[PDB]
Design a protein around this ligand. Structure first.
Ligand SMILES: Nc1ncnc2c1ncn2[C@@H]1O[C@H](COP(=O)(O)OP(=O)(O)O)[C@@H](O)[C@H]1O
Ligand SMILES: Nc1ncnc2c1ncn2[C@@H]1O[C@H](COP(=O)(O)OP(=O)(O)O)[C@@H](O)[C@H]1O
Ligand SMILES: Nc1ncnc2c1ncn2[C@@H]1O[C@H](COP(=O)(O)OP(=O)(O)O)[C@@H](O)[C@H]1O
Ligand SMILES: Nc1ncnc2c1ncn2[C@@H]1O[C@H](COP(=O)(O)OP(=O)(O)O)[C@@H](O)[C@H]1O
Lengths: 574, 173, 307
C-alpha cells in the first residue's frame, strides 16, 4: 500500500548480470533457522541495489529453490511513509498489519542505519520484536556506519551477518558494458563500435581519479553517446560557431571518447596530429631562447616531456624528478618559468612551495592534510587543494636542504611509487606532475675554479650531506656550467630588448652596436653575482637618462635614438 | 555576448539521461546570471536543438515567496502544482546553499523528490560555499556536476564594452 | 585454506620454489627458507604458539630485500598489493605508541583505530612487512616482544587480537659498510658481532632465522639486465612491435653503466633514459609501421628497422 512492490516492476527494470556469488550467499543464509537477517556491507557505487534487484528477478522467474516459492518481496520507502506520535503510530500499524503473512514475506529497508541506529528515538522500540524474530529483514549500508553506529551497542550484534561486496575485476566490467549497451543503443539509435568500448573500459581506471570502482564507465560512455546525437543528428555546431564569430566580427566592425576525458580534467591524451608533430619537434628550439648556454638541462627536460607525451614510460613514477645545483643568479628558476610558459598559455599556473618557515617539525600538520582530531578547521593543507581539480600542474621547490629532516622525510613515499595519504585518509595522485627541486650547496667549491675536481668535490659533499638512500630515487642530478663572454653578450641583448619594446610601446625605435654591448659588459661585470648587476646598471643609467631627456620635450613622433661608444653618446634622429 | 562555451556545456549536460542537474560555480562578479539570461535568450529565439522546444523557464524569488509551517505548506503546494508539466519545465534557483544547506531545516524535506528526479534544477554559488556546506554530507553529491566560469581575458573585455556602449550612449546622449 | 589437499595443491607446492625463483635471482638461501616455512605451515605440523616464521634481512642497499617480499605476496595469492607496509620513520618519539597500538578510550576515544588493529581484523592471513627497524625508539620497539613470544596482543580496549598466521618479516641496513669493504668470513663475523652488540642479547633468541644477502656477480648482472629488458619489450609489444637483443648488447650495457656500490638501479635508469627516448623520438617521425621488428647490436648501439 504505502510501501513499494517490486514483483511487477521486474518486467522493465534493467537486467543485472555477473553477480552469481552474493545471490548464492543470501539464499544460503536465508534458510538458516536462527540469525537469518543478512546485511549488505560495502563502499557506495558497487551495486547493492543491483544485486537486490537481481535476487528479486530470480524469485520472480522461479530459479530460487522451492522453499521460498510462497513469498512476496515488499520494500519500504521513507519518503512515502512520511506530529512525531502520529508517525510512530502509523509505523506501528504498518508492522502489525504486515503480520498477516506470518513468515511468508520479506521486508527490505534502505539506509537502515539512519532510521534505526539514530534525533528520533526508535532503537529501543524496534529492539523487542526484532529480537523475537517476527520476520526476516534485509539492510544495506557502508562500513563506516557499521563502525560508528552499531558497534557501540551489544543488542543489535545478536543478529545480522556481514556480507562483503566488491568489484575489482577489470575484465568483468567489459561484460557489464556489453550487457548494458543495448538499452542505450535503443534509446539513442546511433551506430557504435566495440574497440571504443574496450578502450573506454581500459582508460576509465587509470586517468580519471575519484568516485569509486570502475563501474562508473557507464557515465563516461553515455556522455559521448549523448554528445554525438546533438553533434550530428541535430544541427551541427561548427557552423553555429562560425556564424557567431562572424556576428562578433560584424559587431566590432574511438576518438570521440578520448575528447570527453581530455576536457574532463586536462591531460591531453587525445590523438596526435601534424601540428603536434612540429610543435613537439620544435619544443627544444623554442625553449632554447629564454635560457642561454644550458644545453644539458634543456635537453633533459625536453626529452622527459616528449617521452611522457609519446605514450611510453612506467606508470608508477611522477614522470621525472630533477635536482638543480649551481651558483647563485645563473637562471635556475628561469628555466622553470620558461617551461611553464611553453607547456601551456598560462604564465603563473605553477605553484611555488618554500620551506623557509618550516624549520620546526610541527609544520607537518600544515604542509600536509591535518587530522580532523582537535577542531578540524584548517584541514586544507599546503599540497592538498592545489593539485586537486588540476593534476597537470608543475610543482617547484626551493632551498630544499634548509628544511628539517622530519619534514623532508615525508616526500619519499610519493617519489617511490606516487600517491599520498593525508589526515582525512583521502588518496591524492601525483601521477602527472613534474617535481623540480633546487639547492645552493657546493657553490663555493665550484666558484673557486680544475672543473673536474670541483665537480667531484660538489658530488662528494652532496653525497655525504644527504642519506645514501634518497639519492637513488632522483631521476637525474645536473650542475649548471658558469657562462662565458658570448653568453654575456647574448644575455645583455636579451635584457635590453625588454626596455626596447617597453619604450617602443610609446612609438620610439631602438638601435645599438656591438661596441655598446662591449662597454656595457666591461664596465659593470662581476663574475660572482652572475647577471643581475648588468640589468641594474643598464636600467639605472639608460632609463633615467632617456626619461630626463624626454621630459624636456626633446622627442617627437617617429624619432629613433642611437647609442655608440665615445662611454655613451645619444643622438636623436627621425 | 561572448559566452559561447557555458551555454554549450549546459546544453550538453541537460540532455543526459541521469544526473542532469548542472550547478554553476565561480567567484562573484563574473556573469553567472548573465549566462543564465543568455540561455534564456537562446531558448526564446529558438537556436537551441529542437529537443527542448517545448519547455518554459520559471525562476523562484525568495522575497516574493516569503509561521514556518505556513511557509512550508505553501512551498509544498508550489512544488506539487508545478508537476502539471511533468518534465517540460525547468526550475531556476539563486543562492541554493543558503536555502538548502541551512537555521531553517529543509534539506531532509527537499531530499526525496530531488533524489527521485522530479524535474531539472539549476543552481549558482561560490566555491567556498561548496567547500563548506555540500562536502559535509554524502546525499547531495549523488547529483549535480561542477561547471567552471572565469573571465581572465583582457582582449575579451573590449568586446563586452563595445557591446554595452550602445545602451549608455542612448541613455546619456 | 585448511581444506583437504589435492594433486593441484601437490604440484603447486612442489613448484612453489621454482616459481618464486624467477623475480629473485641468486638468493637461494632466503628463497629456500621462505619456501620451506610456507610448506611446513601448510602441511599441518608446527608449534601452535608461533607466528609461523619471523626473519631478519641484512645486506647492502638496492639488492632486492623487498622484491622477495613482493614476489612472495604475489605468488601466495592473486592479489598484488594486499601486503601492509608499516614504517617508523615518524615514530622517533615514544609518544607514538598510542597511535601504533589501540589507544585507550580515556581522553576522547575518537582515534581508537590503531596502526595494527583494523587491518589484521577480518583478514588474519595477511603479510606484515617492517622497514628500517633500527631507526625506532627502544620503548616503541620493545612492545612487539610479547607477540613474538607466544602470539596474541592486547590493545587499549582490552580486545585480544591474534597474530597466529601472519608472516612477520623485518629488514635493516646495518653492517653495510663492513660487507661492501670486502675476506667474506671476517666481514660476516664483523656484521654479526656488531648486530649482537647493538641489540639486547635477549630479543635475538626469538627470531627464527637471520640471513645476509650475498652480493651478485656478472652472470646475475646479465640475467637481471635481460629481466629489465623484458619489461620494456612487452610494454612496447602492447602496441605491436617485437624486440630482439644479442649478448654483446647486454655486455656493453652492463659495462658502460655499472657501479658495484649501488646495485641494480643505475642499469634501469640508463637503459630507460637512453633506449626509450631514442625509440620514441624515432617513432614520432613515423619511421615505424605494423609488423616491424627492431634489432640492437654493438658498433655503442645501432638501430636497424626491418619487417
Ligand atoms: N551488475 C551491474 N549491472 C549493471 N549496472 C550496475 C551493476 N552493478 C551496479 N550497477 C549500477 O550501479 C548503480 C548502483 O548505485 P547504488 O550502489 O544504488 O548507489 P548508492 O550506494 O549511493 O545507493 C546502479 O545505478 C546501477 O545502474
Ligand atoms: N639565459 C640566461 N642566463 C643567465 N641568466 C639569466 C638568463 N635569462 C635571465 N637571466 C637572469 O637570471 C635571473 C634569475 O635569477 P635566479 O637564478 O632565479 O635567482 P635565485 O637563484 O636567487 O632564485 C633573472 O632575473 C634574469 O634576469
Ligand atoms: N558578458 C557580459 N556582458 C555584459 N555584462 C556582463 C557580462 N557578464 C557579466 N556582466 C555583468 O556582471 C554582472 C553580474 O553580477 P552577478 O555575478 O549576478 O553578481 P553576484 O555574483 O553577486 O550575483 C551583471 O550585472 C552584468 O551586467
Ligand atoms: N633479482 C634481482 N636482483 C637484484 N635486484 C633486483 C632483482 N629484481 C629486481 N631488482 C631491483 O631491485 C630494486 C629493489 O630495490 P630495494 O632493494 O627494494 O631498495 P630498498 O632496499 O631501498 O627498499 C627494484 O627496483 C628492482 O629493479
Amino acid at each position: 500500500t504505502y510501501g513499494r512492490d517490486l514483483v511487477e516492476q521486474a518486467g522493465k527494470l534493467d537486467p543485472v548480470i555477473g553477480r552469481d556469488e552474493e545471490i548464492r550467499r543470501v539464499v544460503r543464509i536465508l534458510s538458516r533457522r536462527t540469525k537469518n537477517n543478512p546485511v549488505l556491507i560495502g563502499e557506495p557505487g558497487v551495486g547493492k541495489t543491483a544485486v537486490v534487484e537481481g535476487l528479486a528477478q530470480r524469485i520472480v522467474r522461479g530459479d530460487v529453490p522451492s522453499n521460498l516459492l510462497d513469498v512476496r518481496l515488499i520494500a519500504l520507502d521513507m519518503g512515502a511513509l512520511v506530529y512525531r506520535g502520529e508517525f510512530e503510530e502509523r509505523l506501528k500499524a504498518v508492522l502489525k498489519e504486515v503480520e498477516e503473512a506470518e513468515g511468508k514475506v520479506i521486508l527490505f529497508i534502505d539506509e537502515i542505519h539512519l532510521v534505526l541506529g539514530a534525533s528520533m528515538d526508535a532503537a529501543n522500540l524496534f529492539k523487542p520484536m526484532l529480537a523475537r524474530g517476527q520476520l526476516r529483514c534485509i539492510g544495506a549500508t557502508t562500513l563506516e556506519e557499521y563502525r560508528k553506529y552499531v558497534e557501540k551497542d551489544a543488542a543489535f550484534e545478536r543478529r545480522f551477518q556481514q556480507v562483503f561486496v566488491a568489484e575489482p575485476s577489470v575484465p568483468d566490467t567489459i561484460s557489464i558494458l556489453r550487457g548494458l549497451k543495448e538499452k542505450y543503443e535503443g534509446h539513442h539509435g546511433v551506430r557504435i563500435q566495440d574497440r571504443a568500448l574496450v578502450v573506454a573500459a581500459q582508460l576509465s581506471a587509470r586517468y580519471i581519479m575519484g568516485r569509486h570502482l570502475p563501474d562508473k564507465a557507464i557515465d563516461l560512455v553515455d556522455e559521448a553517446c549523448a554528445n554525438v546525437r546533438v553533434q550530428l543528428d541535430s544541427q551541427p555546431e561548427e557552423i553555429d560557431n562560425l556564424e557567431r564569430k562572424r556576428i562578433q566580427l560584424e559587431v566590432e566592425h574511438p576518438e570521440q571518447i578520448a575528447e570527453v576525458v581530455s576536457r574532463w580534467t586536462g591531460i591531453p591524451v587525445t590523438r596526435l596530429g601534424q601540428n603536434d608533430k612540429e610543435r613537439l619537434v620544435g619544443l627544444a628550439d623554442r625553449l632554447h631562447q629564454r635560457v642561454v648556454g644550458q644545453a644539458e638541462a634543456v635537453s633533459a627536460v625536453a626529452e622527459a616531456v616528449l617521452r611522457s607525451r609519446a605514450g611510453l614510460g612506467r606508470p608508477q613514477q611522477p614522470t621525472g624528478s630533477f635536482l638543480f645545483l649551481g651558483p647563485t643568479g645563473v637562471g635556475k628558476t628561469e628555466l622553470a618559468k620558461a617551461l611553464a610558459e611553453q607547456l601551456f598559455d598560462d604564465e603563473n599556473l605553477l605553484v611555488r612551495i618554500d620551506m623557509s618557515e618550516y624549520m620546526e617539525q610541527h609544520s607537518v600538520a600544515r604542509l600536509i592534510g591535518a587530522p580532523p582530531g582537535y577542531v578540524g578547521h584548517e584541514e586544507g593543507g599546503q599540497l592538498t587543494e592545489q593539485v586537486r581539480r588540476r593534476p597537470y600542474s608543475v610543482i617547484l621547490f626551493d632551498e630544499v636542504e634548509k628544511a628539517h629532516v622530519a619534514v623532508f622525510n615525508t616526500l619519499l613515499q610519493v617519489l617511490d611509487d606516487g600517491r599520498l595519504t593525508d589526515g582525512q585518509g583521502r588518496t591524492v595522485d601525483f601521477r602527472n606532475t613534474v617535481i623540480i627541486m633546487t639547492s645552493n650547496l657546493g657553490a663555493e667549491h665550484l666558484l673557486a675554479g680544475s672543473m673536474k675536481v670541483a665537480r667531484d668535490l660538489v658530488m662528494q659533499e652532496v653525497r655525504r650531506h644527504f642519506r645514501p638512500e634518497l639519492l637513488n630515487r632522483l631521476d637525474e642530478i645536473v650542475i649548471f656550467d658558469p657562462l662565458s663572454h658570448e653568453q654575456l653578450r647574448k644575455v645583455a641583448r636579451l635584457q635590453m630588448k625588454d626596455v626596447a619594446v617597453r619604450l617602443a610601446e610609446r612609438g620610439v625605435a631602438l638601435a645599438v652596436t656591438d661596441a655598446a654591448l662591449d662597454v656595457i659588459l666591461s664596465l659593470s661585470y662581476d663574475p660572482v653575482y652572475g647577471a643581475r648587476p648588468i640589468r641594474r646598471w643598464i636600467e639605472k643609467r639608460v632609463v633615467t637618462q632617456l626619461s630626463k631627456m624626454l621630459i624636456q620635450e626633446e622627442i617627437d613622433e617617429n624619432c629613433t635614438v642611437y647609442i655608440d661608444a665615445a662611454e655613451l653618446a645619444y643622438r636623436v634622429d627621425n
